[PDB]
Amino acid sequence: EKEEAIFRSAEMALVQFYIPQEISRDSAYTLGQLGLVQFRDLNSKVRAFQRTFVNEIRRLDNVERQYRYFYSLLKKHDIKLYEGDTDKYLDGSGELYVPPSGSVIDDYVRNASYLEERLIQMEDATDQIEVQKNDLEQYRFILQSGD
Amino acid sequence: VKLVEKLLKNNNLINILQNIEQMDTCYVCIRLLQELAVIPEYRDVIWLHEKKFMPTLFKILQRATDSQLATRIVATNSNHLGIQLQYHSLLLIWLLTFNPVFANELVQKYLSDFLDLLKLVKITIKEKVSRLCISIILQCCSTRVKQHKKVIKQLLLLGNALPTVQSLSERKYSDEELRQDISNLKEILENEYQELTSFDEYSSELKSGRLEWSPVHKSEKFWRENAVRLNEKNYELLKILTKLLEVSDDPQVLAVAAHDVGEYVRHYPRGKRVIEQLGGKQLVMNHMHHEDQQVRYNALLAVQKLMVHNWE
Amino acid sequence: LTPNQVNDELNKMQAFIRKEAEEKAKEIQLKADQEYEIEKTNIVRNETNNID
Amino acid sequence: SQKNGIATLLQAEKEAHEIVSKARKYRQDKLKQAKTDAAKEIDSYKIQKDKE
Amino acid sequence: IRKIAESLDANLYDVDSSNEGRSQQLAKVNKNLSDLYTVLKTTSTTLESELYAIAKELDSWFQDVTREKAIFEILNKSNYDTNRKILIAEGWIPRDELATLQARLGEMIARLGIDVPSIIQVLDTNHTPPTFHRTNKFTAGFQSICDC
Numbered sequence: 001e002k003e004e005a006i007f008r009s010a011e012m013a014l015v016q017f018y019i020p021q022e023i024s025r026d027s028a029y030t031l032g033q034l035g036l037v038q039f040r041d042l043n044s045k046v047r048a049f050q051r052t053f054v055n056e057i058r059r060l061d062n063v064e065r066q067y068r069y070f071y072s073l074l075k076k077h078d079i080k081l082y083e084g085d086t087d088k089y090l091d092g093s094g095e096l097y098v099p100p101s102g103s104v105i106d107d108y109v110r111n112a113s114y115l116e117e118r119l120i121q122m123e124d125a126t127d128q129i130e131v132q133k134n135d136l137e138q139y140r141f142i143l144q145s146g147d
Numbered sequence: 148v149k150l151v152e153k154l155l156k157n158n159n160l161i162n163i164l165q166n167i168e169q170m171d172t173c174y175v176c177i178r179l180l181q182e183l184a185v186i187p188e189y190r191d192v193i194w195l196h197e198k199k200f201m202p203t204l205f206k207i208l209q210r211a212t213d214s215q216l217a218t219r220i221v222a223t224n225s226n227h228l229g230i231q232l233q234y235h236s237l238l239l240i241w242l243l244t245f246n247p248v249f250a251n252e253l254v255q256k257y258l259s260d261f262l263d264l265l266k267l268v269k270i271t272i273k274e275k276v277s278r279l280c281i282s283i284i285l286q287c288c289s290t291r292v293k294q295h296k297k298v299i300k301q302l303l304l305l306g307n308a309l310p311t312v313q314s315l316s317e318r319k320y321s322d323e324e325l326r327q328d329i330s331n332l333k334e335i336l337e338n339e340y341q342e343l344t345s346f347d348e349y350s351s352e353l354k355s356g357r358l359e360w361s362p363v364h365k366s367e368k369f370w371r372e373n374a375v376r377l378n379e380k381n382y383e384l385l386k387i388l389t390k391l392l393e394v395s396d397d398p399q400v401l402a403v404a405a406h407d408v409g410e411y412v413r414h415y416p417r418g419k420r421v422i423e424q425l426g427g428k429q430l431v432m433n434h435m436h437h438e439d440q441q442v443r444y445n446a447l448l449a450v451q452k453l454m455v456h457n458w459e
Numbered sequence: 460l461t462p463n464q465v466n467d468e469l470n471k472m473q474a475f476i477r478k479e480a481e482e483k484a485k486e487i488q489l490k491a492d493q494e495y496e497i498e499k500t501n502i503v504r505n506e507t508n509n510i511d
Numbered sequence: 512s513q514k515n516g517i518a519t520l521l522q523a524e525k526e527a528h529e530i531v532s533k534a535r536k537y538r539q540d541k542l543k544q545a546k547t548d549a550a551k552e553i554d555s556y557k558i559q560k561d562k563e
Numbered sequence: 564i565r566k567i568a569e570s571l572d573a574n575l576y577d578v579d580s581s582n583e584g585r586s587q588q589l590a591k592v593n594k595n596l597s598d599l600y601t602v603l604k605t606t607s608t609t610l611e612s613e614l615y616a617i618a619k620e621l622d623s624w625f626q627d628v629t630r631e632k633a634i635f636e637i638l639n640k641s642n643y644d645t646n647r648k649i650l651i652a653e654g655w656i657p658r659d660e661l662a663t664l665q666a667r668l669g670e671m672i673a674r675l676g677i678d679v680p681s682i683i684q685v686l687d688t689n690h691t692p693p694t695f696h697r698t699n700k701f702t703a704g705f706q707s708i709c710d711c
Binding site: 216217221222223224225226227229321323426428429432435438440443444447450451453454 | 594595597598599601602605606608609612643645648673674675677678
Binding site: 039115 | 579618630638641650654656670685
């Protein structure tokens with residue numbers, strides 16, 4: 001079937017939910033893949049700091065912070081990025097195939113950390129040789145006038 | 148008891164518990180066992196008879212290494228059987244262990260096989276796994292049995308997921324029944340490693356002559372907190388570690404040599420002159436030419452230390 | 460699909476909840492049995508100390 | 512069959528939690544018996560030694 | 564002398580009025596000279612290799628974090644309770660899709676939910692359902708300018 005809805009107007013049916021929570025997040029792909037829908041949230045009279053997901057997003061946001069931090073240094077020196085190869089194929093048309101993923105994000109958090117250590121140590125422990133070396137050769141040159 | 152004594156030893160029954168490519172048989176073999184071994188009477192005795200079929204469990208879980216939602220051959224998979232099998236397996240395996248002797252033995256028996264057991268939830272989990280996946284390691288560390296303070300060391304050393312193990316904790320889960328123990332896990336798991344007496348253990352392993360990365364030392368803020376006591380000790384056995392440093396074949400020892408040299412970063416320059424007893428710059432230079440990445444990463448830090456410290 | 464899956468959904472979810480109820484009612488009581496035993500053993504050791 | 516099933520769900524979950532609550536109450540009774548019977552052995556075990 | 568020099572420009576240089584100590588100064592400076600130049604070339608390869616390796620994957624990781632973030636907020640648009648294991652949310656479904664999306668829920672049960680619609684029975688409210696219009700993938704600008 002198909003209704004023009006441009007010589008008319010449409011209507012989307014609401015649905016009552018009593019989904020048990022036991023499929024809470026593993027079922028995320030359910031609507032993440034081809035949800036193609038809108039919601040009427042019921043969470044009212046209570047705010048971010050008062051609700052639950054605020055807590056984890058507080059740990060999350062840090063990863064984006066450090067990522068955009070990296071981006072500057074990455075573009076800094078001489079090199080480009082291949083761009084998201086997934087973006088060409090992973091977001092391929094409209095698919096039910098979106099590969100599953102559960103907790104791996106936390107593994108990503110720890111790994112991006114371990115990295116951020118690498119990055120901080122590198123940047124802050126390489127950014128000094130310059131000046132002390134420079135003054136050292138400066139004095140060396142000064143030595144030449146000792147005759 | 149005598150009835151089950153007959154029922155235990157068989158020939159084909161072992162096959163009924165061996166069909167692993169086809170999972171129909173062991174399934175019941177062990178669901179009925181679960182409903183069986185509830186009472187200690189049969190629990191202990193039957194454990195005294197089946198100490199070779201753990202590989203059953205091992206496959207029942209190791210399969211998940213490669214998995215995909217809409218793949219493999221199963222019809223009506225886990226509405227009641229597909230991973231209800233895993234539910235059985237895990238619940239029985241932990242359930243039975245509550246005689247302190249049981250886990251006390253099994254841990255030393257198959258440390259490693261239950262090492263990656265941590266991976267059970269490293270990536271994937273579903274509803275009923277939560278309460279149990281690590282609720283055995285709960286028992287593997289409880290303060291009621293021998294070696295309840297002896298082996299988990301290596302568990303942590305090879306795992307290192309501890310930060311991500313915490314990362315499992317925060318994401319709230321619907322059930323109360325699991326937040327207490329999961330918190331308990333980390334709290335106890337921190338009150339010993341941070342308490343892992345540094346110079347005691349350090350000098351012990353040093354005088355041993357055999358060494359591993361021993362990443363405790365590199366985690367060093369609390370170790371530098373009393374590095375002055377190392378200056379007291381003056382680490383002349385580190386003068387010996389120099390002798391160790393000329394010739395090396397263990398990647399761990401070779402790289403930790405550089406790491407040990409390098410911790411000066413948080414240590415006062417009053418160590419700089421005792422270093423000045425050293426200082427032939429071609430030494431760690433030729434070492435720098437040893438470019439093996441696995442060590443080279445921190446070999447950069449090592450060779451770099453001298454000059455930025457000059458900045459320091 | 461047709462509105463007939465409710466019988467599966469509700470009944471099976473209650474079956475899961477009940478199943479878990481038996482599992483953990485028996486499990487917590489088994490833990491009770493072991494704790495019973497160890498604490499009784501410790502108290503018996505104390506009485507043996509008195510007797511010694 | 513869910514308009515009148517909200518009360519049924521409430522009752523089923525309440526029963527599922529109250530049965531486990533009574534199971535844990537039975538656990539606590541078991542522990543109380545453990546202690547009160549490990550401390551009452553002086554009636555027989557202690558008087559064994561004076562008979563000796 | 565030194566104060567004005569440094570305030571303007573000066574680098575302290577303990578020197579010798581003859582060429583004898585010249586040798587000592589040459590020796591002491593050459594000490595560090597022999598190695599100074601390493602710092603740069605050493606620092607190079609590490610950042611080179613690490614940036615090459617990471618670049619290929621950081622973008623993917625950003626896509627990830629974004630996607631899981633979004634779904635987490637979507638979840639956050641729902642309700643939870645402890646005593647009763649029940650999750651609550653509402654979404655409005657096309658009138659014509661009154662049954663196909665249930666078959667689609669069929670695609671999230673076979674192995675991902677125990678015959679799980681998790682609900683299919685609906686209680687409806689007088690709240691005005693929204694309408695919709697589409698441009699038929701051929702006249703996007705037409706309808707867009709019409710409706711704006």
